[PDB]
Design a binder for this molecule. Structure first.
Ligand SMILES: *[C@H]1O[C@H](CO)[C@@H](O)[C@H](O)[C@@H]1O
Length: 235
């Protein structure tokens, strides 16, 4: 929301690879994703990323349960290796893929973390990124859908100025995302047996903006959810 946003995200990058993009513009998208992943706090406890390419059919590059989902350097290298497969623009099936990954394919702990779809497309499917039932379903499940059309959660950029869209895209997403509770720092370890330290919830979690009329938004982590208010060590 305002004042900030959570670090625990699941992001499915949905990349158009149609013939209306071309092998040239596809390389720009990959390099855009390369530097984009460089800015995101990619990590097992932070942001998890999945990448899906599509044209006539859907091509899963890697999902959230892959080692690339939690390693920044590993993931950044991989998006550059992504093969260009020409065809039509089957965004519908692509969104169904991101839906499957985000809501059924999470890492063991992260089923209820905020779900985010970042789609990149051209003049096509910009209105079908809202119209298609798959995108509607992601929204009513609490998921967030962002689209970058090249050539508020809808952004426009030209092929020569793609990277200029990164900062404003992060800006809009952070407003839609919830802010976790703000906890105090841990107290010193208590004397023994077993050592125990505590902390306080200074500010309450702030929910994010609903993605559609009257549909659920993530409520953000309480301090109890962010690792509890107490920790116990043994001596
Ligand atoms: C308590 O736990 C550790 C202590 O080193 C840190 O992650 C942090 O200071 C937290 O408040």
């Amino acid at each position: 929301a305002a004042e900030g946003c959570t670090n625990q995200l699941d992001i499915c990058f949905l990349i158009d690879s149609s013939g209306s993009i071309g092998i040239q513009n596809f390389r720009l998208v990959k390099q855009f994703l390369h530097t984009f992943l460089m800015v995101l706090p990619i990590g097992p406890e932070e942001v998890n990323n999945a990448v899906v390419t599509y044209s006539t059919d859907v091509h899963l590059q890697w999902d959230l349960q892959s080692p690339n989902a939690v390693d920044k350097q590993l993931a950044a290298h991989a998006v550059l290796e992504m093969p260009y497969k020409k065809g039509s623009t089957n965004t519908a099936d692509g969104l169904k893929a991101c839906k499957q990954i985000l809501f059924t394919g999470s890492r063991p702990g992260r089923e209820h973390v905020p779900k985010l779809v970042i789609g990149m497309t051209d003049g096509e499917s910009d209105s079908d990124f809202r119209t298609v039932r798959a995108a509607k379903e992601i929204r009513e499940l609490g998921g967030i859908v962002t689209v970058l059309a090249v050539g508020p959660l809808y952004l426009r950029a030209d092929w020569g100025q793609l990277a200029t869209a990164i900062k404003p895209m992060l800006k809009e997403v952070c407003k839609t995302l919830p802010q976790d509770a703000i906890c105090s720092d841990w107290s010193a370890w208590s004397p023994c047996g077993s050592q125990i330290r505590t902390r306080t919830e200074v500010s309450a979690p702030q929910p994010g903006t609903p993605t559609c009329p009257d549909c659920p938004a993530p409520m953000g982590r309480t301090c109890v959810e962010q690792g509890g208010l107490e920790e116990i060590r043994e001596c």
